[PDB]
């Protein structure tokens, strides 16, 4: 894997239909859940990049070289069949390896994006919060809805809550 | 008092393709596909026979253009478009089979 | 000197791929359709 999407974060949120990643906060005003648009779009861009690169066709034209109606001579027929089968094997190998390799990277990059957003919030809170261990951040200055929103759009000033938080350890 | 860290950069980078993106700018890149050709047949270290006006099959039958080639030797044998296997008008049965034999004959 | 020839000349190259002549003979780079494929030899450039 990477840094655990299916690790310390135990499960995903089926209720999160607003994006691919997001925050779920809890305070004195109730329950809150909002998606993160930029990190979601980062993931979406990369996968879209893959798909559009993979979904593609040749502009190379191949013709008929044997005959379904009146069979060609055996010796040239067997060479042709032997060659075609060989190309089939190569493309069968390429195809299955391609898809397998891409799927490994797709899953891992999604892991990557989740880890990147997570450790970003961690640096965003400085010493005002502590790592829960399940992807959560226990805040030590009772953050209100406006405070939470400042964390979401990366504007949270750590040094304006620092005194209160470090006191409460 | 703080210490920062980072990486080198250039004002003018080179764009490359990745699995997931296109035209991403990297510090520097190199070409992997050769387009530069030398419009000459490089022959140093090889005994080269330019058959010129002699047809490769002619070295077997020996028409006038091929008199200098009746017993040739080469690591590299070169056919030319003006070549001709024949003086008296005619042709070879299975001519392409024979050309391929003589091509990899060494002389 | 070279070990890769075609009717138009000689391919003197260490590169793994050539886009000159599909009917090149000898010991050659693999003929490919692409005119160019840039292999990155540095990190991601992030100018100021």
């Amino acid at each position: 894997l990477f840094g655990a999407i299916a690790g310390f974060i135990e499960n995903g949120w089926e209720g999160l239909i607003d994006g691919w990643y997001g925050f779920r906060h809890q305070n004195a005003q109730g329950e809150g859940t909002a998606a993160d648009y930029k990190s979601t779009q980062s993931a979406i861009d990369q996968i879209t990049g893959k798909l559009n690169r993979l979904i593609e066709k040749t502009n190379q034209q191949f013709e008929l070289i044997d005959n379904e109606f009146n069979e060609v001579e055996k010796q040239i027929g067997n060479v042709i069949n032997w060659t075609r089968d060989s190309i089939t094997e190569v493309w069968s190998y390429n195809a299955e390896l391609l898809v397998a390799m891409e799927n490994q990277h797709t899953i891992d990059l999604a892991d990557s994006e989740m880890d990147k957003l997570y450790e970003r919030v961690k640096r965003q809170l400085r010493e005002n919060a502590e790592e829960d261990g399940t992807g959560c951040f226990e805040i030590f200055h009772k953050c209100d809805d406006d405070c939470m929103a400042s964390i979401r759009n990366n504007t949270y000033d750590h040094s304006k809550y620092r005194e209160e938080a470090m006191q409460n350890r | 008092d703080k210490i920062c860290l980072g990486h080198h950069a250039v004002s003018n980078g080179t764009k490359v393709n990745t699995l997931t993106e296109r035209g991403v700018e990297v510090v520097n890149a190199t070409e992997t596909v050769e387009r530069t050709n030398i419009p000459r047949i490089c022959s140093k270290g090889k005994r080269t026979v330019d058959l010129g006006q002699c047809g490769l099959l002619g070295t077997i039958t020996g028409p006038p253009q091929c008199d200098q080639f009746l017993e040739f030797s080469a690591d590299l044998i070169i056919e030319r478009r003006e070549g001709s296997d024949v003086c008296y008008p005619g042709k070879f049965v299975n001519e392409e089979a024979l050309r391929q034999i003589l091509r990899e004959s060494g002389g | 000197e070279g070990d890769c020839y075609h009717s138009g000349g000689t391919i003197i190259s260490n590169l793994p791929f050539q886009n000159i002549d599909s009917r090149a003979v000898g010991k050659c780079p693999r003929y490919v359709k692409q005119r160019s494929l840039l292999l990155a030899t540095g990190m991601k450039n992030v100018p100021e």
Partner: antibody
Amino acid sequence: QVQLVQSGAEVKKPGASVKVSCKTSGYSFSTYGVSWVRQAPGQGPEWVGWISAYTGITDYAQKFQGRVTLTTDATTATAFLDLRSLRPDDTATYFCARDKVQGRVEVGSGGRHDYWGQGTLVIVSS
Amino acid sequence: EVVLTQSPGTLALPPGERATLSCRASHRVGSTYIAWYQQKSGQAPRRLIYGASNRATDIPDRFSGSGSGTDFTLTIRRLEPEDSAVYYCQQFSVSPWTFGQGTRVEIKR
């Protein structure tokens, strides 16, 4: 029915600041975002910039970097194009076009400049 | 950047004949990131082809795009009077998203 309706034509003095709007109807907003193309009289089309209505991320061409600012609906699903320090060269027809799927993975270029606005002439002269 | 150069500058053909419009890129662009547009004097450009060969909604099947790599083609199989316009190709693989200078199509008789 998806339609892009832009603001009326405009006349500005050189060195001023213009603001073209683009009202959105038909689709949902923040599912695509907008590309802007401008066309000088008697000349071809040239791309100006793109903004996501989903993320807010903008991408400009080098020519306009620093004097163009793209923004999107206060809440009414409408995109804006803000140009300033208007040269006489900036005299052109400014088109907005709905462009590129956002909060979703989709193959192909079906949502790439698929619907355009009627246009907006910007005459920059004294 | 990627330069799209179209040819010819001007194409003049009688109605019902076959028109072939070229767009040649400086760099290899993936077929998905290429579009063709029609524009008449005064109006907004309507999208004809997207992804190099896919027809847009309600576009007549006499407009067909093809090609790959650096060479792309818009074919008008049988010209109609209302096909007299200017045609632009576009690339949006890598920014800046660039346009071709265009090809004008004119009719006859």
